[PDB]
Write a protein that binds this ligand. Structure first.
Ligand SMILES: NC(=O)c1ccc[n+]([C@@H]2O[C@H](COP(=O)([O-])OP(=O)(O)OC[C@H]3O[C@@H](n4cnc5c(N)ncnc54)[C@H](OP(=O)(O)O)[C@@H]3O)[C@@H](O)[C@H]2O)c1
Ligand SMILES: NC(=O)c1ccc[n+]([C@@H]2O[C@H](COP(=O)([O-])OP(=O)(O)OC[C@H]3O[C@@H](n4cnc5c(N)ncnc54)[C@H](OP(=O)(O)O)[C@@H]3O)[C@@H](O)[C@H]2O)c1
Ligand SMILES: O=C(O)c1cc2ccccc2c(Cc2c(O)c(C(=O)O)cc3ccccc23)c1O
Ligand SMILES: O=C(O)c1cc2ccccc2c(Cc2c(O)c(C(=O)O)cc3ccccc23)c1O
Lengths: 207, 206
């Protein structure tokens, strides 16, 4: 019943990844995850269909994760770490190469609403990570793949609602999206082509 | 000082390709050193002279620099993650060839990381930045008229020709379009006001 049913999730162990994984498994997706050796999925949580242990910085590991999929969700990040990094942009380069080799077209990837900002107004403490989001978005935009650029504001702990606003190619009217709603939106992007080639800013007022 | 013939190194890269196109459309007689001719586009603006070879091969560089009025350097390694000397060894070959042929003017791209604290550099870019620093030193010590171009993030925005150029420091914006960056490399051929300076081109797109 699902045009998209086998998906790879990068960053499934992270804040948004964990609830995206849980929702995807409940929705009937056959999920493959790439996890780093020292940080596997928690014993409590939902179980994906396939687990690749490795690093998004290894093309071989990314290839093993992307092979055979219908689509890719990207929720990579550096947890609390604000240091200069290229893990997201280099990871995206590997994902793009693997998708082209394996005939996968659809990629839904999370960067940041700061990419819709006047670049000079981003807080300096956040500029190093934002710089790699900028690099990652460029890699994905230039790939020619069917790319939904998800650019959220603050990721919060509020509920799953499915009632959030999706603003196309600009900043939205609220400054938060719950991690659960952000994961819900990443999965919604698999069911439609309407956001392909756009930037999307999901946001909501939790009340 | 009027420049008609230029060599471009790195013409097949993202900045090189648009610099080449703009140079050809503006009337420059352009010589490129390319390792593979098939990487030059089949259509549109074509360079006047194509030397097939390697910036690591001194004979190939000498052949490219001979008879030019100025040199544009847009070399890069793209994927090197660990110590690498391709750019600095290329620049040594370029300097020796410019000296042997009486070519005075070189406009060379490194990166704005040379204007930031070293702790700003992502670990996997430290090797390429180290070699940018080595290449910059090679060019500054050469005695040639050298404009050091140190761009921030290189984007894909359309050509504007309206960017700002900050001298010997960082400017307000943190992006430059590859087209604007190539525009600025060519602007450096028409003036000596940037010689011996570091230049930081940047703009706000929109
Ligand atoms: N927090 C906010 O308010 C906010 C707002 C806007 C945008 N963002 C951006 O949204 C994105 C998702 O944020 P989040 O909080 O959900 O993510 P997160 O909690 O930081 O999780 C990052 C994910 O990436 C994985 N990862 C990191 N490096 C990896 C590597 N080399 N190889 C394989 N996997 C790797 C992590 O695995 P490990 O378990 O092994 O660490 C983890 O699963 C981030 O890019 C973030 O910057 C956040
Ligand atoms: N991307 C950014 O945002 C950014 C920011 C700051 C600074 N920079 C720096 O700006 C400079 C230009 O960047 P770019 O992205 O436009 O360059 P690029 O797309 O990576 O192209 C590099 C050029 O150098 C050539 N090259 C590499 N090794 C060579 C060799 N041995 N012999 C002859 N040619 C060789 C390449 O030829 P082939 O086609 O044969 O490979 C290519 O034409 C780089 O040094 C880069 O580090 C980039
Ligand atoms: O708690 C924080 O550290 C926090 C700090 C901020 C600093 C400046 C502007 C917005 C901030 C937001 C809300 C927010 C926004 O409002 C917007 C926007 O309106 O485009 C985009 C954002 C993108 C990423 C993260 C937050 C975003 C935060 O939560
Ligand atoms: O813009 C930046 O701040 C930036 C700064 C750099 C400074 C020194 C050397 C390379 C840099 C690249 C190269 C680069 C990369 O490093 C990556 C990556 O890390 O995946 C992807 C690229 C995609 C297209 C073109 C260049 C790419 C940048 O981009």
């Amino acid at each position: 019943h699902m045009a998209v049913k086998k998906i790879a999730i990068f960053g499934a162990t992270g804040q948004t990844g964990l609830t995206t994984l849980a929702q995807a498994v409940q929705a009937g997706y056959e999920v493959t995850v790439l996890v780093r050796d020292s940080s596997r999925l928690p014993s409590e949580g939902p179980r994906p269909a396939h687990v690749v242990v490795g690093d998004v910085l290894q093309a071989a590991d990314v290839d093993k994760t992307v092979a055979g999929q219908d689509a890719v969700i990207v929720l990579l990040g550096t947890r609390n770490d604000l240091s200069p990094t290229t893990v997201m942009s280099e990871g995206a380069r590997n994902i793009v190469a693997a998708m082209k080799a394996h005939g996968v077209d659809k990629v839904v990837a999370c960067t940041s609403a700061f990419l819709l900002w006047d670049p000079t107004k981003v807080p300096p403490r956040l500029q190093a990570v934002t710089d790699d989001h900028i690099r990652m978005h460029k890699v994905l935009r230039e790939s020619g793949l069917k790319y939904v650029a998800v650019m959220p504001p603050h990721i919060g702990d509020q509920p799953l609602t499915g009632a959030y606003t999706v603003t196309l190619d600009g900043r939205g009217p609220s400054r938060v999206i719950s991690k659960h709603d952000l994961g819900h939106f990443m999965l919604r992007c698999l069911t439609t082509d309407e956001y392909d080639g756009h930037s999307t800013y999901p946001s909501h007022q939790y009340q």
